[PDB]
Structure formats: structure tokens, C-alpha cells
Structure 1
Amino acid sequence: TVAYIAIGSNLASPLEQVNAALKALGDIPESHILTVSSFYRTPPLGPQDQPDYLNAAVALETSLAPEELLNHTQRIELQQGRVRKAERWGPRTLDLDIMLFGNEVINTERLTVPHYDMKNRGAMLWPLFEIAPELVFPDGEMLRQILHTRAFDKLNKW
């Protein structure tokens, strides 16, 4: 099954964390990376104080069940999602979300797939469109259609 995973980091200098996460994704059992999108920059929410967000999309071929994959992405967030500062570990700065899982619709306590808000997020749709321009959602909506309808501004690469 082809799973699409959204990667985000709002660390001030996020490249090393993102690469560590990408490597870890490739190490997930019964799985392997098919392709990785470019890295996209989005300004912080509200207050300009915060760092920009680095966003990307990964296509992962996997024979794991959806919630088994979530266990692994959540493990990676616990293991690599926080960065040590001088005398303290920082908060979680890495976010791994399952955008799509094959052509499956999932609605459990732990999982909502397709991701509940992805159709509102250029930070998700643009990197996904780069790696899967012909993508069709479970309900028959096309990724191209969503982008065409909303006419989101394009995001700058990192």
C-alpha cells in the first residue's frame, strides 16, 4: 500500500531534524520510501516571532496496517521530535501526519484518513502534487481539482 506522510518542522534550523526523520521513516519495518518531495517554506502563524515551518511529503510503500504505521510515526516523533537545547530538551518540533493510506477511508479514535484538514493546506497539497500530480482521493476528488478550485498561492522551496 502507498501511504503519503506529511512532514513538518518549526525548528529554527530544521534540516537536520527533518533528515533524521526521513532516515527513520525509511527504517520502518515492512516499508520503504518511494519518493520525497522538495522542502517547502511557510511563514509562522500569527506572531512573527516563530520560525518558518518546513513542510514536505513522503510516499511510503508499506505492508503495515494503518494504525501500525501510526505507531511507528509516533515513535519517531518521540525519539527524534525534540531537540536538546543548552540545559533542557525542547518541546516537540517534528510532526508526522498520515495524509492518505492507499485508497482507504479511516475513522477511528486514533486515525482520521484522509487527514481532516489537508484540503485547506497548501503546505500539504503542494508537496503532494509535486510527487503525485494525478492523485485521486478515496471519494473521487482529484488533488489537481482541489488545487485548481482553491487557487492557493505557491510556496517557496526551503
Structure 2
Amino acid sequence: TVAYIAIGSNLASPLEQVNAALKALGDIPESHILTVSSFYRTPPLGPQDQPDYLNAAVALETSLAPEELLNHTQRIELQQGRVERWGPRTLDLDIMLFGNEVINTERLTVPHYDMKNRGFMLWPLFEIAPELVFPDGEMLRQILHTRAFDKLNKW
């Protein structure tokens, strides 16, 4: 299965943190990275009084079940990051899509519950998967077209 993972951090110098997370993602069992988006410098969603975020998207090939993947992303977050509601964030890993699967459990909502509202998630994803279609038939290209989210600056 191809899972799409969003990465975020707003450490002041987040490159080492993001690279460590990227290596950790590739080290997940039965999984490997297919593609990584560019790194993007995005203004904070929430209070203006904090550093910019580094956001990126990762295409991860995996044979793990989706809840097993979440266990690994949550582990990586605990091992590589620290700390609230509107930031700042040491390191966040969001499962945006998991193949074509729809998941609504206590722990896991796939597609990600709010990605449709977040240009810092949609634009990095569109870079690496411009033709992406969501399980319900929505098109990533159309969401960006409908909402006219500001394009992002690279890191």
C-alpha cells in the first residue's frame, strides 16, 4: 500500500529534526520511502508569535496495517520530538491517505480529518501526487482549485 504522510516541525532550525524523522520513516519495518516532496516554509496556522513551520509530504510504500503504521509514526514522534494546541510543534506526523482505504476509528481517521482545509498539507502532496484521487472521488487538484490556497515558499 502507498501511504501519504505529512511532516511538520517549527523548531527554529528544523532540518536535522525533519531528516531524522525521514530516516526513521524509512526504517519502519516492511516499508520504504518512494518519494519526498520539497521542504516548504509555511506561516504558522494558529498564533503568529512562533517560528514558521517546515512542512513536507512523503509517499511511503508499506505492507503494515494502517493502525500499525500509526503506532510507528506515534513512536517516532515520541522518540524524535517533545511537548500544544496551536503550536509550537517539535514534530508531527499525519497519515493523510492510506491507499484507497477509508478509516474512522477512535484512533485513526483517514483521509486526514482536516487536510482539505490546510494548504501546508495539500500543496506538498500535490507536488508528489498531482493526479491524486481521494477514496470518495474528490480530486486533490480540484480541492486546490476550489479553495485557492496560497502557494508555498520552499524552505
When normalised by structure 2's length, the TM-score is: 0.94
| C-alpha displacement of 1:91 | 8.4
> Structure 1 stretch 38-47 or stretch 92-101: which is displaced more?
38-47
Structure 2 Cα separation of the partners of residues 93 and 149 of structure 1: 31
Number of aligned residues: 155
Q: Secondary structure at the match of 2:133?
A: coil
**Contact 1:56–1:127 (CA under 8 A) maintained in structure 2:** yes
Matches within 5 A, 1:1-150: 1-82=1-82, 93-150=90-147
CA distance in 2 between counterparts of 1:49 and 1:28 reads 35
Deviations 1:36-95 (A, max 9, x none): 000111112454320101100000000000000000000000101139xxx999986100
Secondary structure, counterpart of 1:58 in structure 2: strand
Percent identity reads: 99
Please state whether the residue corresponding to 1:147 is helix, strand or coil. Answer: helix
Task: Return the alpha-carbon distance in structure 2 between the equivalents of residues 138 and 88 of structure 1.
Answer: 29
Structure 2 portions without partners, runs of 5+: none
Q: What is the alpha-carbon root mean square deviation over aligned residues?
A: 3.1
Query: Structure 1 residues 47 and 90 mapped into 2: Cα distance closer, same or farther (>3 Å)?
Result: closer
Equivalent residues of 2:11, 2:89 under 8 A apart: no
**Structure holding more strand per residue:** 1
Change (3 A) 1:134 1:90: closer
Structure 2 CA distance for aligned equivalents of residues 128 and 48 of structure 1: 24
Change beyond 3 A, Cα 1:38–1:99: same
CA contact (8 A) 1:77 1:92 kept: no
